[PDB]
Amino acid sequence: HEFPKPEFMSKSLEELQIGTYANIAMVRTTTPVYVALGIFVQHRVSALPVVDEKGRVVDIYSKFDVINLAAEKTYNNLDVSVTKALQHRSHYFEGVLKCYLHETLETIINRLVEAEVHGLVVVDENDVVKGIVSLSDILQALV
């Protein structure tokens, strides 16, 4: 009974209707961590696209990023920028940040597993946010 089904691994994100494409919560490179933490606790979404001055995705900020900040032995306050998370990892340069609607479920799954990341930002031709794909969305496709 193969897991995952080969006929669904070969279908695109668009075809499978996988991800969230409305009401996306996101932040800027100039956003302090206190704003992200407020979003996580009060708005309750799992990952935040981080966009530069042009609206282009340059990182994804997760709840684990906050915990990583909290564990730092150097002195921090919450007025630190979300871009300080980049000292621990670069989702961007490892090619495990973004994805496209036309990409296959197999491609997306291989990308998640590549860096052990829980989410990808769906972008357009200008790297501008269209949606988000998280492990929950993939699990709905895997059923």
Next chain:
Amino acid sequence: HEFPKPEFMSKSLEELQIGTYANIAMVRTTTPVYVALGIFVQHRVSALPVVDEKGRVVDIYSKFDVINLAAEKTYNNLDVSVTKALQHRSHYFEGVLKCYLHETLETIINRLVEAEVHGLVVVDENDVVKGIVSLSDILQALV
């Protein structure tokens, strides 16, 4: 304004009232992945304690575990056991599986960051499930 606050890093899980201690969804070492996947998609919890024949915690099964299974190049079906996830990692032997109510937030945070894990099972003296602590619970303590 220090992040995290030192006066809350020194407090225990019990003292901070961090974690979920009722209505815990969990599975057995004999549980097939199809049962875990159904739980994730329909019951909608982030991590499942995996308990042996004696009710003792021997693993934690996460949504990423399913994605990891899905990416395997060898042939699988969903009748595989949740214990096949153990081929990718041992939360147990790395000491990043369990925690106790009396442990400090700083200890718990350092443990999460140690293996880059998103959750811990709160256990008793017999390694039996008392609750679960996930990144969301920690974020509520960090505010």
